[PDB]
Amino acid sequence: DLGKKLLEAARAGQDDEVRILMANGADVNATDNDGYTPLHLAASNGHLEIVEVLLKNGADVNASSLTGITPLHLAAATGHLEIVEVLLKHGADVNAYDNDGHTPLHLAAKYGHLEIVEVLLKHGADVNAQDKFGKTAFDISIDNGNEDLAEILQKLN
Known part of the structure; x- marks a missing residue:
């Protein structure tokens, strides 16, 4: 109980x-x-x-x-x-993936948390990891209109 x-x-x-x-x-x-x-x-x-x-x-x-x-x-x-x-x-x-292939970096990118993205990146987050849709954290930042965040990730492409 x-x-x-x-x-x-x-x-x-x-x-x-x-x-x-x-x-x-x-x-x-x-x-x-x-x-x-x-x-x-x-x-x-x-x-x-x-x-x-x-x-x-x-x-x-x-x-x-x-x-x-x-x-x-x-x-x-x-x-x-x-x-x-x-x-x-x-x-x-840092690179755990859920059943749809989302990593913490994907989710930080989706919900627009720039400082969290920075922290995950300085602990070995994989910018190249793709979810089940074939999308990287950069792709997700673009899909969700998070432009300031996308800038940072783009330089790591």
């Missing part, structure tokens, strides 16, 4: 509850119906302190949802830079 409560506490930003639930033995890598862990939910909701607490307590930094989405995918897509950095520091795969 503790797993569902940890998932909710992480999503909701309740850090003291997250801590107490762990102490009670909650599975840090419990998953919801979509295969998201507390770390996924904390990352997508921008809860940095909770991200740090989960990692200190053995969260799977490379956990994949039912569709292959990782916490780094979610932090990159939602523009949480500090969380992206922490996840990378703890060993998140």
